[PDB]
Each structure stands twice: as C-alpha cells, then as structure tokens.
Write a protein that binds this ligand. Structure first.
Ligand SMILES: CC[C@H]1C(C)=NN=C(c2ccc(OC)c(OC)c2)c2cc(OC)c(OC)cc21
Ligand SMILES: [Mg+2]
Ligand SMILES: [Zn+2]
Length: 315
C-alpha cells in the first residue's frame, strides 16, 4: 500500500514523454509498467501481488520473435500511458485500468505472421476465427491468463464493472487489427468534421479508443529517428520470414515481405507514413489535441525516410 515504484531520474522524466524508449534492460520492463499503472490509475487499482503474477504470466506467453515480443507489449502500453496522462479528465476509472492491460496483452502469443499468412497456411486459428484471426486469439489468451489462480487483477470489481472492463479490453484488442483501422478512422474523420462526434455516445468512445490503440500500436514511427530506424529492422525481419513462408506455399509474397526487394523499403515506408501513420496521428490530434507530439514526431520520421531515398543518409 505504501510501496511506490520509483525510477532513476532520467527515466522518471523521459517516461512522461511520448518518444520514451523503455531501453534494453528487459528486467526493468515490469517495474516500468507497474510505475505507469500506479501513476495512471492509482496504487489501489490492483493488488501488487496479483498484478506482478499477471505481468510475469503475460511476459512468459509472448514469444521470442524479432518484433511482436514482450518489448513491443510494454512499448505499446507506454504510448497509451502517455496519451492517458496528457488527457487526464477524458477517461473513466475502468478505461484507465483496462486500456493499459489491453495494450500489455494486445499481441499475446503472436508467432510473427499476419492474419493473411494464417489464412493461406490454413492454420487452425483461421478456422476458429474467420476475421481478426490473431486479435481474437490475443483476447482469448488474455482471458485465459486472467482466470489462472492468483491472476485475477479485477477481483475487486462488481460483476458488471468486471464485464464492462473485459468488454473495453476485447474491443481495444480487436481494434489493433489494422484492416479495421481504415474504416474506423474514415468514420471518426466524418464525425469530427460534421460536428457529430460525441464522447458521451458509448459507440463514439469505442471508435476513439480504437484509434488510440492503432496510434499506440504504430508508435515505432513516433520515436527519435535512431529508435524508429532500428525498430524498422525488427519489423521487416518478421515480414521477410513471412515472405519466405509464402514462397514455401508457392505464393509470391507482396514486396513488403519479399527480402529480395530490400531496396524498395524506403519507398514502402513513405507509403506507410502517407497511407497509415500520418492520417492516424492527424485524426488523433484533431480528437485529442495534447497528442500532437505523436503527429510532430511521425512527420519528422517521414522526413528522415525522404532523406534516405535522396541518398542523404544510409540505413
Ligand atoms: C501495425 C502496422 C505495422 C505492422 C506491424 N504490420 N502491418 C503493416 C501493414 C500495413 C498496411 C498494409 O496495407 C498495405 C499491410 O498490408 C497487409 C501491412 C505495417 C507496415 C509497415 O511498413 C510497410 C510498417 O512500417 C512501420 C508497420 C506496419
Ligand atoms: Mg497485433
Ligand atoms: Zn502490436
């Protein structure tokens, strides 16, 4: 109860900034997450003992893949923390609790392969879940871990508060399916521009939480250039492994995933910043003005990728 987590001074100050990098010391990431829960939520949200047992079971159920790993989980949670702390009064107690947990869990038991690859491989999960295949799995894994003995971090909630938070978490994890992002953001753009956006409308809240989840999930593009550039290496290491698996099924992969087309990466990143990242952080900045540093950092990295293309710097 009287047991604060504290961080060294540099981390204590930088963890509040959107562009914070959680660092290479894996053993500090649980501490960093608890620190964020405590400041975002309160020291009373969760029994420390239950929280710690939940964090470590979640960690254990992330795999040793190049990108979709435990470090991505904590990184995506830190971006949500940054959004929540810069928008203090907009979110309920339940939303603050559920969203940091949703981000920590959003890619549970990821294998480093897209929904598309599971569908073409004919993976059992593709028979169980026809759309948002991995995301329905991530939510399945979350509920599993919540139900292990000593792991119910929500035990103090009422029967119906408990249902509301698992419903926040489910929608938040499903929204990390980038195929759903495009329509979600179009709708939010129209609602905001015609003045119909209403944060008291639960179905509007839901859409706005989806957009945050996309923003937090993509936050690699919102770091300082050396972090952004080195992360893009992990990201493409998975894409090219999936590409190789596509070729093993006798399917030319899309160029993104083809390691024979490394030269096209800088132009691929341009498309991604223009078609996905900039639009995402633009609409997010329109709905939540204090998230503008995410849009500013994204724009800076687009400019760094333009420089890579003009040979004014090598990756
Ligand atoms: C969460 C988004 C993230 C990811 C881990 N996976 N999927 C795509 C993607 C996007 C759009 C797509 O539509 C073209 C797509 O095709 C299935 C795939 C992706 C592509 C990137 O660069 C190309 C990228 O660079 C930072 C980051 C991502
Ligand atoms: Mg995912
Ligand atoms: Zn993710």
């Amino acid at each position: 109860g009287l047991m604060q987590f504290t961080l060294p001074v540099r981390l204590c100050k930088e963890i509040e900034l959107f562009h914070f990098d959680i660092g290479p010391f894996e053993n500090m990431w649980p501490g960093i997450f608890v620190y964020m829960v405590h400041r975002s939520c309160g020291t009373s949200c969760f029994e420390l003992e239950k929280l710690c047992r939940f964090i470590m079971s979640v960690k254990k159920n992330y795999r040793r893949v190049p990108y979709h790993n435990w470090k991505h989980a904590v990184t995506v949670a830190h971006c949500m923390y940054a959004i929540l702390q810069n928008n203090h009064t907009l979110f309920t107690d339940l939303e603050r609790k559920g969203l940091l947990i949703a981000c920590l869990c959003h890619d549970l038991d990821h294998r480093g392969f897209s929904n598309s690859y599971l569908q073409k491989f004919d993976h059992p999960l593709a028979a169980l879940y026809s759309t948002s295949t991995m995301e329905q799995h991530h939510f399945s894994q979350t509920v599993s871990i919540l139900q292990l003995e000593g792991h119910n971090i929500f035990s103090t909630l009422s029967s119906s508060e408990y249902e509301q938070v698992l419903e926040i978490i489910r929608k938040a994890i499903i929204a990390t399916d980038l195929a759903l992002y495009f329509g979600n953001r179009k709708q939010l753009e129209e609602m905001y521009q015609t003045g119909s956006l209403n944060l008291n409308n639960q179905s509007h809240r839901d859409r706005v939480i989806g957009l945050m989840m996309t923003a937090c999930d993509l936050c690699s593009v919102t770091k300082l250039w050396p972090v952004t550039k080195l992360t893009a290496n992990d990201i493409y290491a998975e894409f090219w492994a999936e590409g190789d698996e596509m070729k093993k099924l006798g399917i030319q992969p899309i160029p993104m995933m083809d390691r024979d087309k490394k030269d096209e990466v800088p132009q691929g990143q341009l498309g991604f910043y223009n078609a996905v990242a900039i639009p995402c952080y633009t609409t997010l900045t329109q709905i939540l003005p204090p998230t503008e540093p995410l849009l500013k950092a994204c724009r800076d990295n687009l400019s760094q990728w333009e420089k890579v293309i003009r040979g004014e710097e090598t990756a």
